[PDB]
Amino acid sequence: ASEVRIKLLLECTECKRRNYATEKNKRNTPNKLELRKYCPWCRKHTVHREVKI
Amino acid sequence: HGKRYRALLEKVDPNKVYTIDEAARLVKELATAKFDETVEVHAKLGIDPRRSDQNVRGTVSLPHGLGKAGRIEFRNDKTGAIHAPVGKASFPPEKLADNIRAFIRALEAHKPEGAKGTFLRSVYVTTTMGPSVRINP
Amino acid sequence: SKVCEISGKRPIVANSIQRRGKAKREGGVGKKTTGISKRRQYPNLQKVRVRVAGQEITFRVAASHIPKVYELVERAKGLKLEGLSPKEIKKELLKLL
RNA sequence: GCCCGGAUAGCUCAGGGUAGAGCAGGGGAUUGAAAAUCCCCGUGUCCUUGGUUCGAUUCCGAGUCCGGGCACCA
RNA sequence: GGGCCUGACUGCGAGGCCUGCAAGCCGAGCAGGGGCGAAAGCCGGGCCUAGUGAACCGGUGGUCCCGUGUGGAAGGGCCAU
RNA sequence: UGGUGUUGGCUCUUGGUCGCGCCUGCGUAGGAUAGGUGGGAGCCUGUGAACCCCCGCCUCCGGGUGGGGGGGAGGCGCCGG
RNA sequence: GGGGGGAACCUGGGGAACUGAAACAUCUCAGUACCCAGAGGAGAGGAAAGAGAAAUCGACUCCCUGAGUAGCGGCGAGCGA
Numbered sequence A: 001a002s003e004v005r006i007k008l009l010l011e012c013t014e015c016k017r018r019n020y021a022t023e024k025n026k027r028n029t030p031n032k033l034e035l036r037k038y039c040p041w042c043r044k045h046t047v048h049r050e051v052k053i
Numbered sequence B: 001h002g003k004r005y006r007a008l009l010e011k012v013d014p015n016k017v018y019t020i021d022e023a024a025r026l027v028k029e030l031a032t033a034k035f036d037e038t039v040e041v042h043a044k045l046g047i048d049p050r051r052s053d054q055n056v057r058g059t060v061s062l063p064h065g066l067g068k069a070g071r072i073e074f075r076n077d078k079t080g081a082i083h084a085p086v087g088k089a090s091f092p093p094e095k096l097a098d099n100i101r102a103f104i105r106a107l108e109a110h111k112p113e114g115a116k117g118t119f120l121r122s123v124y125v126t127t128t129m130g131p132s133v134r135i136n137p
Numbered sequence C: 001s002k003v004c005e006i007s008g009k010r011p012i013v014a015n016s017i018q019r020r021g022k023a024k025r026e027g028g029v030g031k032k033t034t035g036i037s038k039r040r041q042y043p044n045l046q047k048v049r050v051r052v053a054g055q056e057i058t059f060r061v062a063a064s065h066i067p068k069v070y071e072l073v074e075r076a077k078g079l080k081l082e083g084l085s086p087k088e089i090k091k092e093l094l095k096l097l
Numbered sequence D: 001g002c003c004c005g006g007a008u009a010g011c012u013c014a015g016g017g018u019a020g021a022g023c024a025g026g027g028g029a030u031u032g033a034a035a036a037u038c039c040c041c042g043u044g045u046c047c048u049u050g051g052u053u054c055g056a057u058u059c060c061g062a063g064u065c066c067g068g069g070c071a072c073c074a
Numbered sequence E: 001g002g003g004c005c006u007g008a009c010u011g012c013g014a015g016g017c018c019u020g021c022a023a024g025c026c027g028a029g030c031a032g033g034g035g036c037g038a039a040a041g042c043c044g045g046g047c048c049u050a051g052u053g054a055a056c057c058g059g060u061g062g063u064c065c066c067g068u069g070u071g072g073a074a075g076g077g078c079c080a081u
Numbered sequence F: 001u002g003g004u005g006u007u008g009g010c011u012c013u014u015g016g017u018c019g020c021g022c023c024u025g026c027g028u029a030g031g032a033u034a035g036g037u038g039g040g041a042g043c044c045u046g047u048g049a050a051c052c053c054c055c056g057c058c059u060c061c062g063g064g065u066g067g068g069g070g071g072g073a074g075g076c077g078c079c080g081g
Numbered sequence G: 001g002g003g004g005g006g007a008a009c010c011u012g013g014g015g016a017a018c019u020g021a022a023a024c025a026u027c028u029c030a031g032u033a034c035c036c037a038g039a040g041g042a043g044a045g046g047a048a049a050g051a052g053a054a055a056u057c058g059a060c061u062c063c064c065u066g067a068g069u070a071g072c073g074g075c076g077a078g079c080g081a
């Protein structure tokens, strides 16, 4: 982690619940992460979005 | 102001608030011009003028109204005001309060979702050339 | 300062508590006491001067009970006070409490 | 953490209809020189993007960065 | 070097390495929902061994567990960070 | 050292902010001193119009406004460049 | 009528530190020691503007229990209805 390599949550786009925490280099990668991740609330894959920690 | 108007002024009194019905009974007493005056209903939305999203705009199909049928379009001006024709000075009193009330309803139906204040900060009923009366919406 | 002559109020002992930190209510870690120590809190005594049976009487009474002095004088009306020293008048007045 | 803020040309800067000002640079006048003075000239998505308006550095939303402010730190 | 991709999974975990404690470590297999592959299969980040910090206090998103006569509310618990 | 108690009277000058009354709002095209939109073909006149006489006056210098002395039937908009 | 005395005990007004926290400041020691005032053979408290969930109880005091519970706590040492 650094001011540039940052921590961040991944929120489920369908239930708005954060299910994952991970990191990114925000220079390297200014855009908000989208990724499919299993949301356990919905019990199926869902595209998760980067949300500020 | 002209004698004709100065006259009407007496049948009013600012302080008093009045009621949709009380105002409907005055309208006739306030329409002293040589023609079927209108009536109008001036509000004063308590929302932010310079903006959007929280812009009050739409239509209402008044049960009686106009007589000039219904569906009047109203849109809040740059200030916080919104104005609209509710009928002509003729119309039996028990016919205007039905529209005044039917119009004011639409306004509330078009209030935003992000508005601070009591929305209907103030409301008034009038006639083309007559004075005006506040009212308890 | 010392003892209200009408109410009896006197200096009490209070702690003077020193804190630091952001209250929990404001989303802080909570408050810490950086020091506590004794102090006295005084009644707000003042002089009330008052003329009863022409003689001059003078009370040390807490501000809260300044009006109460004058009430004593009203109730002093039907009293056989004339010709007295101030010392015994005060005594006389104080006796209606 | 939250609140107030500046970004306008090389440097510094004031500003719902617009884009300029000081000296830096260059050309010319002048001088024995260095200047000072004097005349012209440049040097712009007015931080970014999105939205009002007929349109805007000007209003607003959103961003990015430095400037400031207050507080807190198990 | 390329193509597709998000398993840098959610629920667990047989059995071990290490070891005073507390930690640290490796992990087959089953379920859910996926990826890649014709398939066998592989995939619970990164060839590997460093890149870290117990608790307490508190923050923020869920959950809807407790709510001081009762219904709410305050405040707390629980999961995640 | 602020606030407040003990702590009062008169006055001058004052702002904030609440209600109502009214006036001020001039980039250019233009009858020329356009606040935002809406409403609205009549309104202003024996509750005195056309200019005129003292003017609160603001001014972007043309004018905007406002009470009255004089004053005895016409000014201002739809129209439309 | 008071004044002054009385071993302990009682109430009221004031009120430490060593020490413990294996340093220390909040915390503890402890409202203890001690000083002061008053009482009396006791003193204090006492006949609900109480308890608190029993649709209940019924002044106060003292013992046993409830209970090292409920809670309080640099959530530490500890304190403790």
Ligand SMILES: [Mg+2]
Pocket (backbone or CB within 6 Å): A020, A021, A022
């Ligand atoms: Mg993770």
Ligand SMILES: [Mg+2]
Pocket (backbone or CB within 6 Å): A023, A024, A025
């Ligand atoms: Mg990464």
Ligand SMILES: [Mg+2]
Pocket (backbone or CB within 6 Å): A040, A041
């Ligand atoms: Mg779950």
Ligand SMILES: [Mg+2]
Pocket (backbone or CB within 6 Å): C015, C016, C017
């Ligand atoms: Mg204090």
Ligand SMILES: [Mg+2]
Pocket (backbone or CB within 6 Å): C030, C031, C032, C033
């Ligand atoms: Mg504390």
Ligand SMILES: [Mg+2]
Pocket (backbone or CB within 6 Å): C064
């Ligand atoms: Mg008082």
Ligand SMILES: [Mg+2]
Pocket (backbone or CB within 6 Å): none
């Ligand atoms: Mg490869």
Ligand SMILES: [Mg+2]
Pocket (backbone or CB within 6 Å): A036, A037, A038, E007, E009
């Ligand atoms: Mg997954």
Ligand SMILES: [Mg+2]
Pocket (backbone or CB within 6 Å): none
């Ligand atoms: Mg095992």
Ligand SMILES: [Mg+2]
Pocket (backbone or CB within 6 Å): E019
């Ligand atoms: Mg072990």
Ligand SMILES: [Mg+2]
Pocket (backbone or CB within 6 Å): none
């Ligand atoms: Mg599987």
Ligand SMILES: [Mg+2]
Pocket (backbone or CB within 6 Å): none
């Ligand atoms: Mg598979």
Ligand SMILES: [Mg+2]
Pocket (backbone or CB within 6 Å): none
């Ligand atoms: Mg396949």
Ligand SMILES: [Mg+2]
Pocket (backbone or CB within 6 Å): none
């Ligand atoms: Mg298979």
Ligand SMILES: [Mg+2]
Pocket (backbone or CB within 6 Å): none
């Ligand atoms: Mg596996």
Ligand SMILES: [Mg+2]
Pocket (backbone or CB within 6 Å): E056, G074, G076
């Ligand atoms: Mg601790």
